[PDB]
Amino acid sequence: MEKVFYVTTPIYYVNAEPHLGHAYTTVVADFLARWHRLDGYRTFFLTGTDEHGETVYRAAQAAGEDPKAFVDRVSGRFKRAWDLLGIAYDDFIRTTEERHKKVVQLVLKKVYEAGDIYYGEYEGLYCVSCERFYTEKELVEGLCPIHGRPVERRKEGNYFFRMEKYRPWLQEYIQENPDLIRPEGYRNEVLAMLAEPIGDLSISRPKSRVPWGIPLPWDENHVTFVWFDALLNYVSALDYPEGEAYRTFWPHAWHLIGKDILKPHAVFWPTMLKAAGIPMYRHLNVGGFLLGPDGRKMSKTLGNVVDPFALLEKYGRDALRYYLLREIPYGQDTPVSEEALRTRYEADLADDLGNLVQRTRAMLFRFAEGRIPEPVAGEELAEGTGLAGRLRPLVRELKFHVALEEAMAYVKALNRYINEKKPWELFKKEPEEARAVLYRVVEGLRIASILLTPAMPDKMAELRRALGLKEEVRLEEAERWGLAEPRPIPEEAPVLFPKK
Ligand SMILES: [Zn+2]
């Protein structure tokens, strides 16, 4: 009955410009992690950067920097992005780390000793300028997507992993574990993939061609395929196989990814785990695309790119986090825009929540001597204590938008209760009843603020302070009525959600 939660995000190309996609996935993982910690779970939230491969290496060379020095520097870009977005991760794994190198080599050794490795010839269309192979689909009308020049058929010796050997097992595993891959649409997509041969996987290239990475333990002349290397970050960060973190968190592994890297996580990864004798992960949670304002995929080409940091700068971290979690159903392609963020901010935060907090403080000073009144039963508002129980399953099923919707609906109810009861009228002849109404709203806000904490950590803590409530909270405190203590509220408090 030990409550454990482990969530990972994809480790991103280290020199990549952090974008809305990176931001969304990480914000969702952060909500999940924060929510479980709030609910008393022993939690581990992993993030990181993929720092190997020839692309990274050539980027460093082009930048005129030593490769290790290059990645040491550029990796800070993602760390900066997570700080800006208020991501409370437990570890930021960089694939250049020694512990990662050792795990990748140990796992390769295991797969090798399992007899799943063989040396073979890789043949296909090649670009001698990129120094890499390209499928006909990756080409831009038969031309290298990078140099815009024709490609040529070349061959190369690589070591291969007998991935096909595990297809029957994987197919059956997914069939017998309906909730492994969510949402369901992606599961079907993967099943379609596994209906046909998946073949063997090239897990290395000559160092002569790819000189930046982890060497194969049986052949130092070859470097491990970037995907094999990168995928293992999920267990190397737990210090597999002796780390207690591995024993603790791997049994509950949740992987969050965008649909663009589905095959590697739903096909490659599972077969690698099985071959290495490592248990399967618990859930693969697949997100959709965050489309541009015009409903089309984002691209400089189209001019519909929405910059997350531009949004964060203008409306604030919590407003952005809230918007993404409230308006983007995890798993389905959804268009985003500054206009939608602004409307959501003005309606839900500035109006519904912020102004209620403002008016409540005003009425407390006016009718309650600037203090929270003596606790009274919740009456119609007491049902707010049941929201946590209703939200737990929604969160676990990736329905963050529904969860936030329910929490905010309660916030709306608190507003109507105020307008309905009118404490300013009750005070004329029955001040005790007026104060009782004010207590109910304050206690209701306390509860609502806890439910919203995983989405807006700093703002909910600020809201709590504005009402003189206990700042640090636990989800269980949202399930009992009457915890707000009759104490004075701060003489002054900045505007929680200022107009933009
Ligand atoms: Zn090329």
Swiss-Prot record:
Instruction: List this protein's GO terms for biological process.
Output: methionyl-tRNA aminoacylation
Q: How is the subunit organization of this protein annotated in UniProt?
A: Homodimer.
User: Where does the motif 'HIGH' region lie?
Assistant: 12-22
- According to the record, how does the cofactor bind? Binds 1 zinc ion per subunit.
User: Briefly, what is this protein's role?
Assistant: Is required not only for elongation of protein synthesis but also for the initiation of all mRNA translation through initiator tRNA(fMet) aminoacylation.
Q: Catalysed reaction(s)?
A: tRNA(Met) + L-methionine + ATP = L-methionyl-tRNA(Met) + AMP + diphosphate
Q: Which residues bind ATP?
A: 300
Motif ('KMSKS' region) positions are 297-301
Give the family, as the similarity comment puts it. Answer: Belongs to the class-I aminoacyl-tRNA synthetase family. MetG type 2A subfamily.
Gene Ontology CC: one annotated term: cytoplasm
- What keywords would UniProt list here? Aminoacyl-tRNA synthetase, ATP-binding, Cytoplasm, Ligase, Metal-binding, Nucleotide-binding, Protein biosynthesis, RNA-binding, tRNA-binding, Zinc
Protein's recorded name: Methionine--tRNA ligase
- Where is this chain primarily localised? cytoplasm
Portion of the full sequence shown: 1 to 500 of 618
The coenzyme or cofactor needed here is:
Zn(2+)
- Single GO molecular-function term? tRNA binding
Localization, UniProt: Cytoplasm
Q: What is its EC number?
A: 6.1.1.10
UniProt lists the gene as metG
Sites binding Zn(2+) sit at 127, 130, 144, 147
